[PDB]
Amino acid sequence: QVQLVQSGAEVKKPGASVKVSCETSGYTFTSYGISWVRQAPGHGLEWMGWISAYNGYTNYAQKLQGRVTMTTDTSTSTAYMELRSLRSDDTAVYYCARDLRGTNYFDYWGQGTLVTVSSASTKGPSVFPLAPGTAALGCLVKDYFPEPVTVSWNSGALTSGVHTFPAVLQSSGLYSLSSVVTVPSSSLGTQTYICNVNHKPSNTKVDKRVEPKSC
């Protein structure tokens, strides 16, 4: 099995640097080259550079102001990428791909790591209720950092009609999403609806009850 396995996700403050690793297996390492391709939220694929373990040759995109540095360990057959002088522009997902030397035909990829660059700090989310023929109720997960958050309903027992929306970056630097669900209005008095918000970066597991308003 030929596989490329990248490191974990990382969050950095602006001005600092980040080093992502990519451990490959399943082929003779020197016989292929390694390229790096990142994608920012709302944008398409962007080539960053190519490195040939055989020759040691490297080529980077002039769009990155020479902030990139690719290295290679052949004895362990792993690739490394370093991005210095991080800006908020660089918040994106970084992918490590292989190609048959100079072909630039990327057959097998890595899973991609999330790199988040922002002057914000880790903050647990604040869960607020969204109270009610058909009824609709939801949870508002507001002001958390960094992404992501996993949101289930009734400890995973309610899946039909659920819509968890992608988070939106607020003007403060803190994400905020909403997860809603439609339920028959004839069950609002015999079925309690709870949403489970888990934010692993802050180890913030929260179970919030959603009930109709007072009147």
Binding site: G33, Y54, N55, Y57, N59, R101, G102, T103
Partner: peptide
């Protein structure tokens, strides 16, 4: 001739 260069390619940008 260069091993990392294949026909019809821009070899001057791909290799040393």
């Amino acid at each position: 001739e260069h091993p990392d260069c294949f026909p019809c390619q821009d070899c001057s940008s791909k290799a040393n």
